[PDB]
Design a protein around this ligand. Sequence first.
Ligand code: SF4
Ligand code: SF4
Ligand code: SF4
Ligand code: SF4
Ligand code: FES
Ligand SMILES: [K+]
Ligand SMILES: [Zn+2]
Lengths: 115, 96, 87, 119, 209, 48, 60, 129, 699
Amino acid sequence: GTSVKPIFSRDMNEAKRRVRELYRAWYREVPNTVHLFQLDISVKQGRDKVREMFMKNAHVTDPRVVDLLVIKGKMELEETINVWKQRTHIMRFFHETEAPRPTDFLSKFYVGHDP
Amino acid sequence: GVRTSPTGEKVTHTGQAYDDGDYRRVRFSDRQKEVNENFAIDLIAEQPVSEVGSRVISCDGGGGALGHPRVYINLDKETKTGTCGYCGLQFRQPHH
Amino acid sequence: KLGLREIRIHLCQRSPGSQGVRDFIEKRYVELKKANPDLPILIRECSDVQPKLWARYAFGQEKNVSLNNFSADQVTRTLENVLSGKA
Amino acid sequence: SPRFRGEHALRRYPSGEERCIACKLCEAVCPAQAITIEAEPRADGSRRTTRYDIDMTKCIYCGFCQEACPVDAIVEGPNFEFSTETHEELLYNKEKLLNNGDKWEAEIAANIQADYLYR
Amino acid sequence: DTRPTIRPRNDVVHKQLSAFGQYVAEILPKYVQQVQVSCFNELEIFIHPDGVIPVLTFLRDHTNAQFKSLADLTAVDVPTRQNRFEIVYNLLSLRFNSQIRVKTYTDELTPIESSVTVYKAANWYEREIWDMFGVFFANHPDLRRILTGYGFEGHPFRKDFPLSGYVELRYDDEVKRVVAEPVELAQEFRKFDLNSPWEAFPAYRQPPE
Amino acid sequence: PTTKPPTARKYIWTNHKFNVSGTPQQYVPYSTTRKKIQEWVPPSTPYK
Amino acid sequence: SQCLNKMPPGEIKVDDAKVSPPKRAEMKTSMESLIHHFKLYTEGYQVPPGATYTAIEAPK
Amino acid sequence: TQDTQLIAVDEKLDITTLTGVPEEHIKTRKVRIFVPARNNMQSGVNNTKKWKMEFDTRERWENPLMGWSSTADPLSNLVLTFSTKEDAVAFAEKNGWSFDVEERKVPKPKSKSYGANFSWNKRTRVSTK
Amino acid sequence: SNLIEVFVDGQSVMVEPGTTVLQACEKVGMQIPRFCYHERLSVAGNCRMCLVEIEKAPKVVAACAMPVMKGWNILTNSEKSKKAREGVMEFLLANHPLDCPICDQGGECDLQDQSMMFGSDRSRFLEGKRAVEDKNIGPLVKTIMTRCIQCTRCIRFASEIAGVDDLGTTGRGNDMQVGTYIEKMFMSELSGNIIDICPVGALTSKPYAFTARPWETRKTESIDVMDAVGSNIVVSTRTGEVMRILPRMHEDINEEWISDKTRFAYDGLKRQRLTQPMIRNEKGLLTYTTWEDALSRVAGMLQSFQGNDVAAIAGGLVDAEALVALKDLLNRVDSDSLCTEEVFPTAGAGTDLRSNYLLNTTIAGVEEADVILLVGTNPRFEAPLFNARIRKSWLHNDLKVALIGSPVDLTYRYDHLGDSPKILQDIASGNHPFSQILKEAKKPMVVLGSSALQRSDGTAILAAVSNIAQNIRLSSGVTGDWKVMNILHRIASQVAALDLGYKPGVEAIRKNPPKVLFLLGADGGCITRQDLPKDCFIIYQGHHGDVGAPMADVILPGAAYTEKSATYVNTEGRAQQTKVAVTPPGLAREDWKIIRALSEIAGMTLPYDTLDQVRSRLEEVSPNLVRYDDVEGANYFQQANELSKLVNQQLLADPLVPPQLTIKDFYMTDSISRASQTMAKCVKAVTEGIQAVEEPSIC
Ligand code: SF4
Ligand code: SF4
Ligand code: SF4
Ligand code: SF4
Ligand code: FES
Ligand SMILES: [K+]
Ligand SMILES: [Zn+2]
């Protein structure tokens, strides 16, 4: 029924807690990768990208779900500070080559039959 | 057989031919449009029709196992020579 | 002029709340059409739909008013109010 | 060996008519989905294929296609050598397949003659 | 045997394993939910998820079982079943030259205790299952992607995942680095509806729901 | 081949060709099918 | 050495045509063989439902 | 049943946060849950006993080089079989897809009688067998 | 009660007496193999494959034509049953030609699957197979007669569902040629359905002709729009094109049959089509252009004119989404002149009461009616599936069909009251003999066709027929739920337009000649340039340019009925959704995506922006056109009656003559049908003799 087995967190609050030290670690992590990975973006240009994912992932309310991606974020952070990823992998977050996609209905109508 | 398009292209057996504008034609320039001359359509017409006398005639296509599944063509309609649907060889009764 | 371009009622065939408008159209409808032959009183109906009246005025103008559990004379006044302002 | 698998070819009957009656069996068995064919009722009334693009950059030379068609239409030739300088040249269409059939016909007739009894 | 095509049947092994099926069921009635032996003499031990650690230790340590080799650790994602994923273990008993299969069920969210302690082989199998399917395994030494590319999102072996995927790759010169783009096939995967509309096996006919 | 001549037929080539990649005789792929959707040709008579 | 010395005569595929494709000889003369070859190379043999794990002593 | 700190979560399941479906393919795409129709040119009814969920069709343009069926919607050739309808739809909300449900069309029960082919007065006498 | 308890494979089932053995095992999922027994057709037992083992019985029984009684266990999987299945199937495959590599049915091939399930894996035949000469019976059905095996399926379908008694068997023994003997031409409105009832690949779709093969094609479900019955069809598409149209199963809508008009009309989608927006150049020739300027020109001068000078005449194959989009766009300029090609009498209830303009009794209702009154219509070519239901109920329930109008044949005996409309008022008074028959009938029925109302006296006939219905409704012979009055429509998207509020007919446009005419799908060619004043901005949407495009200034291209997710409602008020099969060709977009995009640039932007939004608005206008596949049974026939006798009109002397009188005019109905070549070939086939039509194919 409603009773489900929680992963680590026991309600929203410490689920809200775990997203913090992920942000705590990510924020401390940005400037050294920009140096180590020889990135083209600025130190400022990394914090927003770290930031914008977080409230992009904001409609989520289930405590089990919240703890599930905080592990994925931790793993992504894990596979970043050992330079396991590469310049291309990190840059894939910046949708650079992909041209901007329209948003208004009229532009959708002009390009092709798609919602 | 192989004709010539107004642009200069060679129509294939299917009749495909890039038309006048047809920006795709750029590929053939400095190259050739590969066309097979041995057109199957007219390479079977000149084959004569067998004058075998019976009502049902088998057609192995030659070579037995080398041919096509053995089909029995009914040579009864005395207007049109029966043809095997696998190879196109025309068979007909010897007009009684 | 925004006068009564069309009138639309949406009632349920069997919902007890829709009973009131069903009685209204059963009795006080033919007189309404004779009164306003030009004005089309659409009676698009369905099932499990609460009794509902739609009014269409001039350029892209539409107003809504529910007829839930409305009595017979209750909805006659409701339409009478709607078509009173023939402008 | 006579049953070697290589560059494909679309042979034709001794009369000259092509063997492929477009039964789509080879497409239906293609493990790499390299076969792409569409048929049409030809002018003579026979049942041939308008398009027979074989993508030599997808298929893996299983040889299922030569086992597939009951008229021995498609068959890999003994020619292991057809390396090209551009990617597009490898994408074969029906016309190139027939040309390969007309070029290696001496080998395919002989090789199939040797191995038609083992199968 | 007059029949030269039908695979021979080994009833002695069938009876032997079925008796062991009653054995394991009686020893651990707390986790074992169902036990069956297939026609080709394979025993499936249907356990409850919390029994992953206790049951496995029994077959690995009990003198009469002695299953001391983790053959494989897989899951078959069934979108139909309420808890879609179904984690499957295969164990081989060197002493009794027999194979057993303990199968358990799990949804996307509920975690399964990692069998690394009872079977240290499971450790790398543990990582693959999460990577391909998304079944998170609790208290694991190091859960991480093992197969997919670094930063790859989604769980590929999941049925809802498309065959071609969502992300392609190519070299783009204005950035002088490999970049990811939305998938755009030069040829869509021609799906084939190759299912006979006639019943194939009267023996396995589902009840007339 | 001198001892056993291959069976000769009409369509067999009479001039073998090397692989023609590189040279301007190279093979270029092209769709062998006809057009699927044509378009309604506008009339020649004027608007009125 | 033993396999070469004890090679038995017989066919090379299961006689069941619903499982293994028939030879090309009966393909082109018999109805049932062609039907089976058609479905086998288009649909394939439908195996019974079930799961199994078969392991062999591969060289690795 | 487990004594594992069973929290009573109530919010409806939504794993769209984790499956990784890109933003375009999660909201805009509409899936249809239906029982496949019996192929009318056949007669067997084995293919109409399992609910199937399929996604809407998108653009199919021909490749310039050789006439192909190139598309750019990964969720095109993805159907999923489901035992019962409520179980099929439970997948849709869980993966947050705007679903459309049909109903299981089944052949209505007919009454066949060989004796009707030869009636004394009823105009159902078959002219030839 | 009555249920008889019988067993199948041990398990006990509860069966209604007279149930055949085949039905009994179907209740548990066991599908006995069959080749002659079709549920919709009669039973003949010619199959000899349904042989099944009866428990404690010496004789194998035919499961099809055998009434099961109590104390019987159907041993389906018994050895005796399998041997009988093996025996007869080997007989079936003895004389089948080795064709299915080239036979089109390969892939479905009811022989193949059953052989792969119930049959041997080798052939012990050692003799020569028989060959049968092919007979031509249509430019739309191929006949490789050497493949088929003792049909009784083609024969029964012609003699029961189509009425055409031309198919038959000739001779005895192994040959007993099945066909037409003399060279005849099997044409009927439902002739094409012999193709999908053929287990063997002899009767094959001639237009198909090996276009593709079953496994590679994708099947999507939609609703046909060619007729107004709204038959459920399966649009089999591959690689972005439509090769075949198959009939789905819906029982009350279309059973499992579709008209040849609906089947072999997909080729019209590939004929003359609009791809890009086109506008008039300086000289007056339409020229291709971008979407922006075509919309800008329309939006620019739609902004200028307002009031009742901006009209729109919706065509035949129109989307309810398109209708509501045009309605909202063309009402923000205050122009309630939304018209349509089909004309319905506005005198009285008009479009207000749903009970008037739809088949109130529902299609399935005609299968329990006692007497019927077809008035001034030819349902065979107007709504072929509706005529089949009349025939089916005429066949079984012994319904007494009566026809007032043209003597057109209807595949059954009809009582011709005449053709003069004066007969209608004679029946209403009661002097005519048929009046009392409707009194005694317990479920009497009257039906009118939109073709009849298309006359100048549409109000006169509709009021008269409504007077007739009440004149027998006052008698309690009708039940408390029976809906006597019925109106059969021909144009598919005319019920939706009438439901939405579109003014029926086109008289509104003539009374006020507009300055901008929005021809949206219109192709009847009723409003030419002469009617509207000089310098009209005739904007033509649509898919097939037939008559709207030649008279236009802007040629905004729309999608087709297989290239969108529209909602088409049938003649009985059952809003059905048509799913997208192949995307619109060229640069054409969806229909509602035109008006919504047009409104945004023009300035009076429509509220809805997505498909779900427009349906929600479509719900707001009417609450039934969203509820899918459910006849929202309307009421209120009686108030529409006293509302109708107001004007009273007057009947003319012209006999009721439907526009469709012979098979010849059936195929040439709409833009899709006219464009298609196969439809033209069928028209040629029936115009001249029975031999000038044939497609060369050795399939
Ligand atoms: S050789 Fe095999 S993989 Fe290659 S095209 Fe033929 S069937 Fe396909
Ligand atoms: S090549 Fe062979 S398998 Fe392919 S269509 Fe032709 S005959 Fe059939
Ligand atoms: S009916 Fe056609 S497809 Fe079926 S077995 Fe005969 S030839 Fe082959
Ligand atoms: S075409 Fe079909 S129904 Fe007609 S005789 Fe042949 S097998 Fe029977
Ligand atoms: S099913 Fe063919 S005989 Fe009963
Ligand atoms: K058929
Ligand atoms: Zn032949």
